[PDB]
Design a protein around this ligand. Sequence first.
Ligand SMILES: [Mg+2]
Ligand SMILES: [Mg+2]
Ligand SMILES: [Zn+2]
Ligand SMILES: [Zn+2]
Ligand SMILES: [Zn+2]
Ligand SMILES: [Zn+2]
Lengths: 68, 68
Amino acid sequence: YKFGGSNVHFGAGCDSCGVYPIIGDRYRCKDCKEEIGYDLCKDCYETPSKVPGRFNQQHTPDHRLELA
Amino acid sequence: YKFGGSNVHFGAGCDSCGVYPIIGDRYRCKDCKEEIGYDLCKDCYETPSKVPGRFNQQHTPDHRLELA
Ligand SMILES: [Mg+2]
Ligand SMILES: [Mg+2]
Ligand SMILES: [Zn+2]
Ligand SMILES: [Zn+2]
Ligand SMILES: [Zn+2]
Ligand SMILES: [Zn+2]
């Protein structure tokens, strides 16, 4: 069981706007190799901006994201 | 970013043993239709017989669990 379902992502923060926990849809990077990973909230996902990551992930526009 | 990586699943509990949060690998049911979902810790996952769920998920042995 997981409380809140996909409406909340406990422990996940948005690397663009910094919101934590992400509320609503979460998009996680499939290609970032850093253990901390890389994530965006839906709003930041819809508006592509320059964000390599708040924790030195060096995410690029060529990486693939997926709804989590 | 997601603190703890895959070593911790905040907000997720094991429907068999009750550990919360699940630490270590997490196995999520692909077929339980209920929004709360169904999850197991690795130790309860390795046991072939599967509990129906602590939140009335009525999980059945037919259902398939995936590594999350
Ligand atoms: Mg906050
Ligand atoms: Mg506990
Ligand atoms: Zn954001
Ligand atoms: Zn990335
Ligand atoms: Zn367990
Ligand atoms: Zn199930």
